[PDB]
Amino acid sequence: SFLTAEDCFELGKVAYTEADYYHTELWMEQALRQLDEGEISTIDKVSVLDYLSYAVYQQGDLDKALLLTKKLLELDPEHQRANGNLKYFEYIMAKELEHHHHH
């Protein structure tokens, strides 16, 4: 039917609290798409991206989790957990590059 971005966000949070990261990603992506199309809503993109990035990381999609973390930081450069996540992903990527340069 029609769920608001806030509806989707709330459903995403229920999924997240049940450790259903598949449905977390679906609900949060729908919330983000509706916000990106200009829906007026009290939820902010930053919180949606925070749940989405975490859910995508749980699914093992590290590249997508990095991209979402960067998107979050563009919107909130001082976000503490996103900054931590980024340094972790950059460490891993630096390791991989070091490996390639020795082999």
């Binding site: 925070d50 749940y51 990035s53 975490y54 989790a65 931590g84 996540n85």
Partner: peptide, 5 residues
Amino acid sequence: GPAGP
């Protein structure tokens, strides 16, 4: 360790 909300 990536942290979530």
